[PDB]
Amino acid sequence: GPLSVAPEMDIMDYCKKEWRGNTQKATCMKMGYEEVSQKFTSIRRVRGDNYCALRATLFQAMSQAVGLPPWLQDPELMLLPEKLISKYNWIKQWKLGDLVDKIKESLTLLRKKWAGLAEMRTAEARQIACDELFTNEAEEYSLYEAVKFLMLNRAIELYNDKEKGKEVPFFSVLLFARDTSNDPGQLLRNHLNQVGHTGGLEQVEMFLLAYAVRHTIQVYRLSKYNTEEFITVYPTDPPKDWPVVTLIAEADRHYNIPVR
Ligand SMILES: [Ca+2]
Ligand SMILES: [Cl-]
């Protein structure tokens, strides 16, 4: 299919096309892109479907991959679908975009693709491969199923930790505080099953995504330009060794990718 992450273009050309006229909002958006442009020259427009946060994050992460992270090296990753689903039968309420075989296939694909990108000797080779992966075919959407599953797993771990009275990050308190997400099954039925289908990730879920793929997500939040949230980093205090991916969000809904 066609690319789902558009070829790059100059960031201020993009801004000039999108934000015309004299409103306060347009001016704030221009200021926001000007700030991004201090560090990045170009932007790739990410398909604005209900997977956009996952597509933006994963595209960035994979296109920058120079190694296979330990969490993807771990043999336990491939065993996780069987163990989780066997233990928590309610995971069978998973809405696809048996179940154990499907999720395992998706995780295997994620690992295989990531490992192949990491092996590549030129960054251009990596960009070519990574473009081909994000062409709106079954493989792309399989990656999202894997990432969603990792999000569920991390949420289960955090919930169980909280139950045992163990220290957890505060975002997880906020995640489970939502009346539609009080436990992992509610998270699955009311939030994760909707992702890619009827809605995208909420703020608190961007922290969950970051934890699930062990990447630090630095977001220019243009609707927050004249405030301290003009950039928000997910999580706030990650391990120093998590790679960093940078995104742009005009309105905390849709994410695009700055490049240099
Ligand atoms: Ca190129
Ligand atoms: Cl034009």
Residue numbers in the entry: 78 to 174, 183 to 345
What does the paper say about this structure?
Here, we reveal a previously unannotated human DUB, OTULIN (also known as FAM105B), which is exquisitely specific for Met1 linkages. FAM105B comprises 352 amino acids (aa), and the OTU domain spans the majority of the protein (aa 80–352) and an N-terminal region with predicted helical content. Having established FAM105B as a Met1-linkage-specific OTU DUB, we named the enzyme OTULIN (OTU DUB with linear linkage specificity). Crystal structures of the OTULIN catalytic domain in complex with diubiquitin reveal Met1-specific Ub-binding sites and a mechanism of substrate-assisted catalysis in which the proximal Ub activates the catalytic triad of the protease.
Next, we determined the structure of OTULIN D336A to 1.35 Å resolution. There were no global structural perturbations, but His339 was now in the active rotamer, and Cys129 showed increased occupancy of the active rotamer. Both mutants stabilize His339 in the active conformation, generating a more reactive enzyme. Strong effects of Glu16 mutation were also observed in the OTULIN D336A mutant.
